[PDB]
Amino acid sequence: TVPESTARMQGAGKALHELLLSAQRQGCLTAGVYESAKVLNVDPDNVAFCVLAAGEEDEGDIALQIHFTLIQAFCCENDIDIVRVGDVQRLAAIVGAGEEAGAPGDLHCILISNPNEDAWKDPALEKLSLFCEESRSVNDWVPSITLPE
Amino acid sequence: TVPESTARMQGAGKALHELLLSAQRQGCLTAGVYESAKVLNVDPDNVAFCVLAAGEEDEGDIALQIHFTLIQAFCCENDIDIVRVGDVQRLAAIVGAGLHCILISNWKDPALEKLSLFCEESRSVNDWVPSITLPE
Amino acid sequence: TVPESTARMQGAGKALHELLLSAQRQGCLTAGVYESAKVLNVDPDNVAFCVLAAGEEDEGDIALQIHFTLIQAFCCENDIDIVRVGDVQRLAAIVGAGLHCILISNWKDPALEKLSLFCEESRSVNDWVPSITLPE
Amino acid sequence: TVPESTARMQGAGKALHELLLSAQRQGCLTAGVYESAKVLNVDPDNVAFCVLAAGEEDEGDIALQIHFTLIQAFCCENDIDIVRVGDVQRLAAIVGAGEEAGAPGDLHCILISNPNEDAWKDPALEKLSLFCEESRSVNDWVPSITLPE
């Protein structure tokens, strides 16, 4: 069967897809490494979730990876759930500025913050939090989520 | 029941166990971050495998993590298979000197073939540096 | 008497004072580390000058320092003149928003010509990113 | 006159030259970034001085510079005097493995540790320490030493 593709993992990917869309819709998604870093540096207290996205090429972009080292360390230090994802383009397609793209749709970092408008408390958030708990409990500290696709 | 516990994952764990043991029954096996980094800087054309190992304790060790980052970026650049292990003590049960990084250098070995396939299968689903659960 | 207090250094300080003032009497002048880093990532063909500023307080700010490192390496790669200033408050007396990095973008200006010569003269003696002492 | 070339600076460069030679001779010089890092990580308590050396090319070697960020931060945090120097080859020529070089003589980091054999207390060390004090007092935190040459 497909590598890494369990029900747990299938569910995590679907939840993330949903969370990215609802977060975007509710205006509580931050897109971009520098935009994300600035929020984490200024006021991190409302970020519920972080996604780091790097393609195979991005693995040898030392600057990008060093930024990842910093964001990830910060997230761990501040108990913010964080997953890695290996398809940058798909991430961009799901969020704002996808579907075609003059100058590549390439976001390497997303923060999802709490909307509290009296808003929707997406259960997708909860499932993903559980997923990351499930990873820690098996000593996978930097968990990845695969395309259910 | 039990996150990440696949047949594939299990065969991966055993294979890394075997591989680690094959080295240590030979020179190989450069141990530690600073040791390994020079090896990569000096002679990376001969290195076949890398294992980064860290516990939850080490997530706020920015020095160690920056090095994990530089090691990982290099291996990926230079097509060395590389893997994360999360249980530093269980790794220590297989080998001494503690031990956050292991290089395997100048191979057929069912274990090495198998792990090599494991890593390509991870790449298939965009997991460029996958985690391995050691057995016991 | 007074370390680093050369005629050349003095003319450098005044020229940076003037340059900073010329911008702020214009768009230019991207302020701050995260701001500047995107600018460099996005459109570095238009950036003419960088100033990293930090105090003794900031030497153990590894986040800030890693960014100083990435900014500096980029500028050198891409031939943007870049300079270190050691008095963050005295820098603040010239410009608001506090402020560890300043980009100047899309120039003749005696100050900019002069600083451009200053930086080449630093390179002459292998000082790739020199310090400037602001006057007052 | 030559940029940066004051008596203070002329003296600093000569002192450093001397310190590199005496340290080498007394077997209390550590050569290399990884060798240096390991000493600083294991037991830093006997290192008196650090030299970081990078040529113009080295300025765009992100890995090297990140190592520099770490060594330098550590040195500042632990009050070890540290200077930067911009001629790697000359540094190598002065220390071991210079004068010709099969596979370039390229050391990017030197630590000088206390010899105490009942040994020579090089005054060059003292002058350089003073030099670095003189730099701090003028808000030049990462001081450089130029070739008197």
Coordinates of C-alpha atoms in Angstrom, one line a residue:
Chain A
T1 CA 0.0 0.0 0.0
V2 CA 1.0 3.7 -0.2
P3 CA 3.8 4.6 2.2
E4 CA 2.7 6.2 5.4
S5 CA -1.0 6.0 4.4
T6 CA -3.0 4.9 7.4
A7 CA -6.5 6.0 8.4
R8 CA -4.9 8.3 11.1
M9 CA -2.8 9.8 8.3
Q10 CA -5.6 10.0 5.8
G11 CA -7.7 11.8 8.4
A12 CA -4.9 14.2 9.4
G13 CA -4.5 15.3 5.8
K14 CA -8.2 15.9 5.3
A15 CA -8.4 17.8 8.6
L16 CA -5.5 20.0 7.5
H17 CA -7.1 20.7 4.1
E18 CA -10.2 21.7 6.0
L19 CA -8.4 23.8 8.6
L20 CA -6.5 25.7 6.0
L21 CA -9.7 26.6 4.2
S22 CA -11.7 27.6 7.3
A23 CA -8.8 29.5 8.8
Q24 CA -8.4 31.4 5.5
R25 CA -12.1 32.1 5.4
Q26 CA -12.3 33.4 9.0
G27 CA -9.2 35.6 8.3
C28 CA -7.0 33.9 10.9
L29 CA -4.4 32.4 8.6
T30 CA -0.9 33.9 8.3
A31 CA 0.9 33.0 5.1
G32 CA 4.6 33.2 4.6
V33 CA 7.9 32.5 6.5
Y34 CA 8.7 36.1 7.3
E35 CA 5.1 37.1 8.0
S36 CA 4.8 34.0 10.2
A37 CA 8.1 34.8 12.0
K38 CA 7.0 38.3 12.7
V39 CA 3.7 37.1 14.3
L40 CA 5.7 34.6 16.4
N41 CA 8.2 37.2 17.4
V42 CA 5.7 40.0 18.2
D43 CA 2.7 38.1 19.7
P44 CA 2.6 34.3 19.4
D45 CA -0.1 33.9 22.1
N46 CA -3.0 33.3 19.6
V47 CA -1.4 30.9 17.1
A48 CA -2.9 27.4 17.4
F49 CA -1.0 25.6 14.6
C50 CA 1.9 25.9 12.2
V51 CA 2.6 24.3 8.9
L52 CA 6.1 24.2 7.4
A53 CA 6.2 23.2 3.7
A54 CA 9.3 22.3 1.7
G55 CA 9.7 20.5 -1.6
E56 CA 12.6 18.3 -2.5
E57 CA 14.6 21.3 -3.8
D58 CA 13.8 23.4 -0.7
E59 CA 15.7 20.7 1.3
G60 CA 19.0 22.2 0.0
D61 CA 18.0 25.9 0.6
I62 CA 20.0 26.5 3.7
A63 CA 18.5 29.9 4.5
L64 CA 15.0 28.5 4.3
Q65 CA 15.9 25.5 6.4
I66 CA 17.5 27.7 9.0
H67 CA 14.3 29.8 9.2
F68 CA 12.5 26.4 9.7
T69 CA 14.9 25.5 12.5
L70 CA 14.0 28.8 14.2
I71 CA 10.2 28.6 13.7
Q72 CA 10.1 25.0 14.7
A73 CA 12.2 25.4 17.8
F74 CA 10.0 28.4 18.9
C75 CA 6.8 26.3 18.3
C76 CA 8.2 23.4 20.3
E77 CA 9.3 25.8 23.1
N78 CA 5.9 27.4 23.1
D79 CA 3.9 24.2 22.7
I80 CA 2.4 25.2 19.4
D81 CA 1.5 22.1 17.3
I82 CA 3.6 22.1 14.1
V83 CA 3.7 19.7 11.2
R84 CA 5.8 19.4 8.1
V85 CA 4.3 18.9 4.6
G86 CA 6.2 18.2 1.4
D87 CA 4.1 19.7 -1.4
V88 CA 4.4 23.5 -1.4
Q89 CA 2.4 24.0 -4.6
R90 CA -0.6 22.1 -3.2
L91 CA -0.5 24.1 0.0
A92 CA -0.6 27.3 -2.0
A93 CA -3.5 26.0 -4.2
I94 CA -5.6 25.3 -1.1
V95 CA -4.9 28.7 0.5
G96 CA -5.0 32.2 -1.0
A97 CA -3.2 32.9 -4.3
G98 CA -3.4 29.5 -5.9
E99 CA -4.9 28.1 -9.2
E100 CA -2.5 29.4 -11.8
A101 CA 0.3 31.6 -10.4
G102 CA 2.3 34.4 -12.0
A103 CA 5.6 34.1 -10.1
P104 CA 5.2 30.6 -8.4
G105 CA 2.6 30.0 -5.7
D106 CA 5.1 29.2 -2.9
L107 CA 4.3 29.5 0.8
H108 CA 6.7 27.7 3.1
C109 CA 5.0 28.6 6.3
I110 CA 1.4 28.9 7.5
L111 CA 0.2 29.9 11.0
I112 CA -3.3 29.2 12.0
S113 CA -4.5 31.4 14.8
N114 CA -7.7 31.2 17.0
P115 CA -10.5 33.1 15.3
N116 CA -12.7 33.6 18.3
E117 CA -15.4 35.8 16.7
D118 CA -17.9 33.8 18.7
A119 CA -16.7 31.9 15.7
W120 CA -16.5 28.2 14.5
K121 CA -14.2 26.1 16.7
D122 CA -13.1 23.8 13.9
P123 CA -12.8 20.2 15.1
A124 CA -10.2 19.8 12.4
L125 CA -8.0 21.8 14.8
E126 CA -8.6 19.3 17.5
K127 CA -8.0 16.2 15.4
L128 CA -4.7 17.7 14.2
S129 CA -3.7 18.5 17.8
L130 CA -4.5 14.8 18.6
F131 CA -2.4 13.7 15.6
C132 CA 0.6 15.7 16.9
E133 CA 0.0 14.2 20.4
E134 CA -0.1 10.8 18.8
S135 CA 3.3 11.5 17.1
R136 CA 5.1 12.7 20.2
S137 CA 3.9 9.6 22.0
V138 CA 5.8 7.5 19.5
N139 CA 8.9 9.8 19.6
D140 CA 8.2 11.4 16.2
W141 CA 8.9 15.0 17.3
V142 CA 8.7 16.7 13.8
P143 CA 5.6 15.0 12.4
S144 CA 4.7 15.1 8.7
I145 CA 1.3 14.9 7.0
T146 CA 1.1 13.3 3.7
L147 CA -1.3 14.1 0.8
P148 CA -4.4 11.9 1.2
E149 CA -4.4 12.4 -2.6
Chain B
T1 CA -3.9 1.5 17.8
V2 CA -0.2 2.6 18.1
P3 CA 0.6 5.6 15.8
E4 CA 3.0 4.9 12.9
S5 CA 3.1 1.1 13.5
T6 CA 3.1 -0.3 9.9
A7 CA 4.7 -3.5 8.6
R8 CA 6.9 -1.3 6.4
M9 CA 7.9 0.7 9.5
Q10 CA 8.7 -2.4 11.5
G11 CA 10.9 -3.7 8.7
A12 CA 12.6 -0.4 8.6
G13 CA 13.4 -0.5 12.3
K14 CA 14.9 -4.0 12.1
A15 CA 16.9 -3.0 9.0
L16 CA 18.4 0.0 10.8
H17 CA 19.2 -2.2 13.8
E18 CA 21.0 -4.6 11.4
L19 CA 22.8 -1.8 9.5
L20 CA 24.1 -0.2 12.6
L21 CA 25.3 -3.6 13.8
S22 CA 27.0 -4.4 10.5
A23 CA 29.1 -1.2 11.0
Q24 CA 30.8 -1.4 14.4
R25 CA 31.5 -4.7 12.9
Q26 CA 33.7 -2.4 10.7
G27 CA 35.3 1.0 10.7
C28 CA 32.4 3.2 9.4
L29 CA 29.9 4.7 11.7
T30 CA 31.4 8.2 12.4
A31 CA 29.6 9.1 15.6
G32 CA 28.5 12.6 16.7
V33 CA 27.6 15.9 15.1
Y34 CA 31.0 17.7 14.8
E35 CA 32.7 14.5 13.7
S36 CA 30.2 13.8 11.0
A37 CA 30.1 17.5 9.7
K38 CA 33.8 17.4 8.9
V39 CA 33.4 14.0 7.3
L40 CA 30.7 15.5 5.0
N41 CA 32.9 18.7 4.4
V42 CA 35.9 16.6 3.7
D43 CA 34.8 13.4 2.0
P44 CA 31.0 13.1 1.3
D45 CA 31.4 11.0 -1.9
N46 CA 32.0 7.9 0.3
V47 CA 29.1 8.4 2.8
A48 CA 26.1 6.1 2.3
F49 CA 23.7 6.8 5.2
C50 CA 23.0 9.2 8.1
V51 CA 20.9 8.9 11.2
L52 CA 19.9 12.0 13.2
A53 CA 18.8 11.1 16.7
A54 CA 17.2 13.5 19.2
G55 CA 14.8 13.5 22.2
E56 CA 12.1 16.0 23.2
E57 CA 14.8 17.5 25.5
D58 CA 16.8 18.6 22.4
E59 CA 14.1 20.6 20.6
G60 CA 15.2 23.8 22.3
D61 CA 18.9 23.1 21.8
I62 CA 19.3 25.6 19.0
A63 CA 23.0 24.8 18.5
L64 CA 22.2 21.1 18.0
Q65 CA 19.2 21.9 15.9
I66 CA 21.2 24.3 13.6
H67 CA 23.6 21.4 13.1
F68 CA 20.8 18.9 12.4
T69 CA 19.6 21.4 9.9
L70 CA 23.0 21.8 8.2
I71 CA 23.6 18.0 8.2
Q72 CA 20.2 17.3 6.7
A73 CA 20.4 19.9 4.0
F74 CA 23.7 18.6 2.9
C75 CA 22.6 15.0 2.7
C76 CA 19.6 15.9 0.7
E77 CA 21.8 18.1 -1.6
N78 CA 24.2 15.2 -2.0
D79 CA 21.8 12.3 -2.1
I80 CA 22.7 10.6 1.1
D81 CA 19.8 8.8 2.7
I82 CA 19.0 10.3 6.1
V83 CA 16.6 9.3 8.8
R84 CA 15.3 10.7 12.2
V85 CA 15.2 8.5 15.3
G86 CA 13.4 9.8 18.4
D87 CA 14.6 7.5 21.1
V88 CA 18.3 8.4 21.9
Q89 CA 18.6 5.9 24.7
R90 CA 17.2 3.0 22.7
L91 CA 19.7 4.0 19.9
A92 CA 22.3 3.9 22.7
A93 CA 21.4 0.3 23.5
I94 CA 22.6 -0.6 20.0
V95 CA 25.8 1.5 20.1
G96 CA 28.0 3.3 22.7
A97 CA 29.6 6.8 23.0
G98 CA 26.9 8.4 25.1
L99 CA 25.3 10.5 20.0
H100 CA 23.0 12.7 17.9
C101 CA 24.3 11.8 14.5
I102 CA 25.6 8.7 12.8
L103 CA 27.4 8.5 9.4
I104 CA 27.8 5.2 7.5
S105 CA 30.5 5.4 4.8
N106 CA 32.7 3.3 2.5
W107 CA 27.8 -2.3 0.4
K108 CA 24.9 -4.6 -0.6
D109 CA 23.4 -5.9 2.7
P110 CA 19.7 -6.8 2.9
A111 CA 19.4 -4.1 5.6
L112 CA 21.0 -1.3 3.5
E113 CA 19.1 -2.2 0.3
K114 CA 15.9 -2.4 2.4
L115 CA 16.5 1.0 4.1
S116 CA 17.5 2.5 0.8
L117 CA 14.1 1.4 -0.6
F118 CA 12.4 2.6 2.6
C119 CA 13.8 6.1 2.0
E120 CA 12.8 6.2 -1.7
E121 CA 9.3 5.1 -0.7
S122 CA 9.2 8.0 1.8
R123 CA 10.2 10.4 -1.0
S124 CA 7.3 9.0 -3.1
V125 CA 4.9 10.7 -0.7
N126 CA 7.1 13.8 -0.2
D127 CA 8.6 12.8 3.1
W128 CA 12.2 13.7 2.4
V129 CA 13.6 12.8 5.8
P130 CA 11.4 10.2 7.5
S131 CA 11.3 9.0 11.0
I132 CA 12.2 5.4 11.9
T133 CA 10.9 3.6 15.0
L134 CA 13.6 1.3 16.5
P135 CA 12.2 -2.0 17.8
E136 CA 14.1 -3.3 20.8
Chain C
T1 CA 43.5 58.2 22.1
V2 CA 39.9 57.0 21.1
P3 CA 40.0 53.6 19.3
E4 CA 38.9 53.7 15.6
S5 CA 38.7 57.5 15.4
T6 CA 40.1 58.2 11.9
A7 CA 39.3 61.1 9.5
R8 CA 38.0 58.4 7.1
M9 CA 35.8 57.0 9.9
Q10 CA 34.4 60.4 10.8
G11 CA 33.6 61.1 7.1
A12 CA 31.9 57.7 7.0
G13 CA 29.7 58.5 10.1
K14 CA 28.6 61.9 8.7
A15 CA 27.9 60.3 5.3
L16 CA 25.7 57.6 6.8
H17 CA 23.9 60.2 8.8
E18 CA 23.2 62.1 5.6
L19 CA 22.2 59.0 3.7
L20 CA 19.8 57.9 6.3
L21 CA 18.3 61.4 6.3
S22 CA 18.0 61.5 2.4
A23 CA 15.8 58.4 2.7
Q24 CA 13.0 59.2 5.1
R25 CA 12.9 62.1 2.9
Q26 CA 11.7 59.4 0.5
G27 CA 10.1 55.9 0.4
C28 CA 13.2 53.7 0.7
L29 CA 14.6 52.7 4.0
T30 CA 12.9 49.3 4.7
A31 CA 13.1 49.1 8.5
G32 CA 13.7 45.9 10.5
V33 CA 15.0 42.4 10.1
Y34 CA 11.9 40.4 8.8
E35 CA 10.8 43.3 6.6
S36 CA 14.3 43.6 5.0
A37 CA 14.7 39.8 4.5
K38 CA 11.6 39.5 2.4
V39 CA 12.7 42.6 0.4
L40 CA 16.0 40.8 -0.3
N41 CA 14.1 37.5 -1.1
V42 CA 11.7 39.3 -3.4
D43 CA 13.5 42.3 -5.1
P44 CA 17.2 42.6 -4.3
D45 CA 18.2 44.0 -7.7
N46 CA 17.0 47.4 -6.5
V47 CA 18.6 47.5 -3.0
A48 CA 21.7 49.8 -2.7
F49 CA 22.7 49.7 1.0
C50 CA 22.2 47.9 4.3
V51 CA 22.9 48.8 7.9
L52 CA 22.9 46.2 10.6
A53 CA 22.7 47.7 14.1
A54 CA 23.0 45.9 17.4
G55 CA 24.2 46.5 21.0
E56 CA 26.1 44.3 23.4
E57 CA 22.7 43.2 24.7
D58 CA 22.0 41.5 21.3
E59 CA 25.1 39.3 21.1
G60 CA 23.3 36.4 22.8
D61 CA 20.1 36.8 20.7
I62 CA 20.8 33.8 18.5
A63 CA 17.5 34.4 16.5
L64 CA 18.6 38.0 15.7
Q65 CA 22.2 36.9 15.0
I66 CA 21.2 34.1 12.7
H67 CA 19.2 36.7 10.7
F68 CA 22.2 39.2 10.8
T69 CA 24.1 36.3 9.4
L70 CA 21.7 35.5 6.6
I71 CA 21.2 39.2 5.7
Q72 CA 25.0 39.8 5.6
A73 CA 25.8 36.7 3.5
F74 CA 23.1 37.7 1.0
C75 CA 24.4 41.3 0.6
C76 CA 27.9 40.1 0.1
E77 CA 26.7 37.5 -2.4
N78 CA 24.7 40.1 -4.2
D79 CA 27.1 43.1 -3.9
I80 CA 25.1 45.3 -1.6
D81 CA 27.2 47.4 0.6
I82 CA 26.6 46.6 4.2
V83 CA 27.8 48.1 7.4
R84 CA 27.6 47.5 11.2
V85 CA 26.6 50.1 13.7
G86 CA 27.1 49.5 17.4
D87 CA 24.9 52.2 19.0
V88 CA 21.2 51.3 18.4
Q89 CA 19.9 54.3 20.4
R90 CA 22.1 56.8 18.6
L91 CA 20.8 55.3 15.3
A92 CA 17.3 55.7 16.8
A93 CA 18.0 59.5 17.3
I94 CA 18.3 59.7 13.4
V95 CA 15.2 57.5 12.7
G96 CA 12.1 56.1 14.5
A97 CA 10.4 52.7 14.7
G98 CA 12.1 51.6 18.0
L99 CA 15.4 48.6 14.4
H100 CA 18.3 46.2 13.8
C101 CA 18.4 46.4 10.0
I102 CA 17.9 49.1 7.4
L103 CA 17.7 48.6 3.6
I104 CA 18.1 51.5 1.1
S105 CA 16.6 50.7 -2.3
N106 CA 15.6 52.4 -5.6
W107 CA 21.2 57.6 -6.6
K108 CA 24.3 59.8 -6.8
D109 CA 24.4 61.7 -3.5
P110 CA 27.8 62.7 -2.0
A111 CA 26.9 60.6 1.0
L112 CA 26.1 57.5 -1.0
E113 CA 29.2 57.9 -3.3
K114 CA 31.3 58.5 -0.2
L115 CA 30.0 55.4 1.7
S116 CA 30.3 53.3 -1.4
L117 CA 34.0 54.4 -1.5
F118 CA 34.3 53.7 2.2
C119 CA 33.1 50.2 1.8
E120 CA 35.5 49.4 -1.1
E121 CA 38.4 50.8 0.9
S122 CA 37.3 48.4 3.7
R123 CA 37.4 45.5 1.2
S124 CA 40.9 46.7 0.2
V125 CA 42.1 45.5 3.6
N126 CA 39.8 42.5 3.7
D127 CA 37.2 44.0 6.0
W128 CA 34.2 42.8 4.1
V129 CA 31.6 44.3 6.4
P130 CA 33.0 47.2 8.4
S131 CA 31.8 49.1 11.4
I132 CA 30.8 52.7 11.3
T133 CA 30.8 55.1 14.2
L134 CA 27.9 57.5 14.1
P135 CA 28.8 61.0 15.2
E136 CA 25.9 62.8 17.0
Chain D
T1 CA 46.8 56.3 4.2
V2 CA 45.9 52.6 4.3
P3 CA 42.3 52.1 5.5
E4 CA 42.0 51.1 9.1
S5 CA 45.8 51.2 9.6
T6 CA 46.5 53.0 12.9
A7 CA 49.3 52.1 15.4
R8 CA 46.8 50.4 17.6
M9 CA 45.8 48.2 14.6
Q10 CA 49.4 47.7 13.5
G11 CA 50.3 46.5 16.9
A12 CA 47.2 44.2 17.1
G13 CA 48.2 42.5 13.9
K14 CA 51.8 41.9 15.0
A15 CA 50.6 40.7 18.4
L16 CA 48.3 38.2 16.7
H17 CA 51.0 36.9 14.4
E18 CA 53.2 36.4 17.4
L19 CA 50.4 34.8 19.5
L20 CA 49.6 32.3 16.7
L21 CA 53.2 31.3 16.5
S22 CA 53.8 30.9 20.3
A23 CA 50.5 29.2 20.8
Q24 CA 51.3 26.8 18.0
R25 CA 54.8 26.2 19.5
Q26 CA 53.4 25.6 23.0
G27 CA 50.8 23.1 21.7
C28 CA 47.9 25.2 22.9
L29 CA 46.4 26.2 19.5
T30 CA 43.3 24.5 18.1
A31 CA 42.9 24.7 14.4
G32 CA 39.6 24.3 12.5
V33 CA 35.9 25.2 12.8
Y34 CA 34.7 21.8 13.9
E35 CA 37.7 21.1 16.1
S36 CA 37.2 24.5 17.7
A37 CA 33.5 24.0 18.1
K38 CA 34.1 20.7 19.9
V39 CA 36.5 22.2 22.4
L40 CA 34.0 25.1 23.0
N41 CA 31.2 22.5 23.4
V42 CA 33.2 20.0 25.6
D43 CA 35.3 22.3 27.8
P44 CA 35.7 26.0 26.9
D45 CA 37.1 27.0 30.3
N46 CA 40.8 27.2 29.1
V47 CA 40.4 29.1 25.8
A48 CA 41.8 32.6 25.9
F49 CA 41.2 33.8 22.4
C50 CA 39.4 32.9 19.2
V51 CA 40.1 34.0 15.6
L52 CA 37.4 33.6 12.9
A53 CA 38.9 33.9 9.3
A54 CA 36.8 34.3 6.1
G55 CA 37.8 35.5 2.7
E56 CA 35.5 37.4 0.4
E57 CA 34.1 34.2 -1.1
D58 CA 33.5 32.7 2.4
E59 CA 31.1 35.6 3.0
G60 CA 28.5 33.8 0.9
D61 CA 29.1 30.3 2.4
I62 CA 26.0 30.2 4.6
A63 CA 27.0 27.0 6.5
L64 CA 30.4 28.5 7.4
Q65 CA 28.8 31.8 8.5
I66 CA 26.2 30.0 10.6
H67 CA 29.0 28.2 12.3
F68 CA 30.6 31.6 12.9
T69 CA 27.4 32.9 14.3
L70 CA 27.4 30.1 16.8
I71 CA 31.1 30.3 17.8
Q72 CA 30.9 34.0 18.1
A73 CA 27.7 34.0 20.2
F74 CA 29.3 31.4 22.5
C75 CA 32.5 33.4 22.8
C76 CA 30.6 36.7 23.6
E77 CA 28.4 34.8 26.1
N78 CA 31.5 33.3 27.8
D79 CA 33.6 36.5 27.6
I80 CA 36.3 34.9 25.3
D81 CA 38.0 37.6 23.2
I82 CA 37.3 37.0 19.5
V83 CA 38.4 38.8 16.4
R84 CA 37.7 38.4 12.7
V85 CA 40.4 38.4 10.1
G86 CA 39.9 38.5 6.3
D87 CA 42.8 36.5 4.9
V88 CA 42.4 32.8 5.4
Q89 CA 45.5 31.8 3.5
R90 CA 47.8 34.0 5.5
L91 CA 46.4 32.7 8.7
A92 CA 47.2 29.1 7.5
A93 CA 50.7 30.1 6.4
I94 CA 51.5 31.5 9.9
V95 CA 50.1 28.4 11.7
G96 CA 50.7 24.6 11.0
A97 CA 50.3 23.3 7.4
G98 CA 51.2 26.4 5.4
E99 CA 53.9 27.2 2.8
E100 CA 52.6 25.4 -0.3
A101 CA 49.4 23.3 0.3
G102 CA 48.1 20.2 -1.4
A103 CA 44.3 20.8 -1.0
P104 CA 44.2 24.6 0.1
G105 CA 45.5 25.7 3.4
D106 CA 42.2 26.9 4.8
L107 CA 41.5 27.3 8.5
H108 CA 38.4 29.4 9.4
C109 CA 38.7 29.1 13.1
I110 CA 41.6 29.2 15.7
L111 CA 41.3 28.9 19.4
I112 CA 44.2 29.8 21.6
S113 CA 44.1 28.2 25.0
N114 CA 46.2 28.9 28.1
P115 CA 49.4 26.9 28.0
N116 CA 50.3 27.0 31.8
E117 CA 53.3 24.7 31.7
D118 CA 54.8 27.1 34.1
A119 CA 55.0 28.4 30.5
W120 CA 55.4 31.7 28.8
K121 CA 52.5 34.2 29.5
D122 CA 52.7 35.8 26.1
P123 CA 52.1 39.6 26.5
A124 CA 50.7 39.5 22.9
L125 CA 47.7 37.8 24.5
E126 CA 47.3 40.8 26.8
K127 CA 47.7 43.4 24.1
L128 CA 45.0 41.6 22.0
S129 CA 42.7 41.4 25.0
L130 CA 43.2 45.2 25.4
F131 CA 42.5 45.7 21.7
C132 CA 39.2 43.9 22.1
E133 CA 38.4 46.0 25.2
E134 CA 39.2 49.1 23.2
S135 CA 36.8 47.9 20.5
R136 CA 33.9 47.2 22.8
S137 CA 34.4 50.7 24.3
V138 CA 33.7 52.2 20.9
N139 CA 30.7 49.9 20.3
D140 CA 32.5 47.7 17.8
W141 CA 31.4 44.3 19.1
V142 CA 32.8 42.1 16.3
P143 CA 36.4 43.6 16.0
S144 CA 38.6 42.9 13.0
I145 CA 42.3 42.8 12.7
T146 CA 44.0 43.8 9.5
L147 CA 47.2 42.6 8.0
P148 CA 50.0 45.0 9.1
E149 CA 51.4 43.8 5.8

